[PDB]
Amino acid sequence: SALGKLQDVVNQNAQALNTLVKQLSSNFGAISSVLNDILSRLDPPEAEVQIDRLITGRLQSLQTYVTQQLIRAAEIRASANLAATKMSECVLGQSKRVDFCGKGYHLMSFPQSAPHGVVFLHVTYVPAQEKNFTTAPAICHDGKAHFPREGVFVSNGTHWFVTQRNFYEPQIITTDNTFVSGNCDVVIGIVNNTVY
């Protein structure tokens, strides 16, 4: 049942056609559903009354089929438009839209053709093994408030480091890691520590 979406489209179209063909076995109030039998049995004047009943039913059957096909076609068009957008934004580029190209941080996608459809193999980055750390918004060093240029301040219990905020890579808090802004009196949660 991996390809249920594609199978449903095939089944629905096949089911609709079968229903359309099965409607040729309905009297719709005529003496028989076989047009030749009516002609062979009745003369023109009475045959028209019987034939007209079949025309009304058969014509109504066709209109019902076409209207359903138009509604189904619109649904397929919306799906195709989405697939085209996924091809451009997931395969021809890297997407920052959340969950648009799979679960996790999207890296790349590969297209695979399927009957009446397309399959996308979304490659994502998923962080795996998290650890608790104590954190602070800024470091107070010399009456100055230091903030991470790109990362977050963490402590293993005794020492403070800067790490990129998607993968634990602790580093010494230096003047290149951080930038200064104001003093230590305004930031809530600032912690004393040396900036090397």
Binding site: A2, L3, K5, L6, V9, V10, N13, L17, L20, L62, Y65, V66, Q69, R72, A73, I76, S79, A80, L82, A83, K86, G102, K103, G104, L107, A114, H116, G117, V118, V119, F120, L121, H122, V123, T124, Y125, V126, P127, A128, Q129, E130, K131, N132, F133, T134, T135, A136, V152, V154, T163, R165, N166, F167, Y168, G189
Partner: peptide
């Protein structure tokens, strides 16, 4: 004052299926 940071990662590959076309029928 607590933060969780991932120390490792997994590369996941997931499949997505989208219908594109349906049978061309003429009556």
């Amino acid at each position: 004052n607590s933060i969780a940071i991932p120390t490792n990662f997994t590369i996941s590959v997931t499949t997505e299926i989208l219908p594109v076309s349906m049978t061309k029928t003429s009556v």
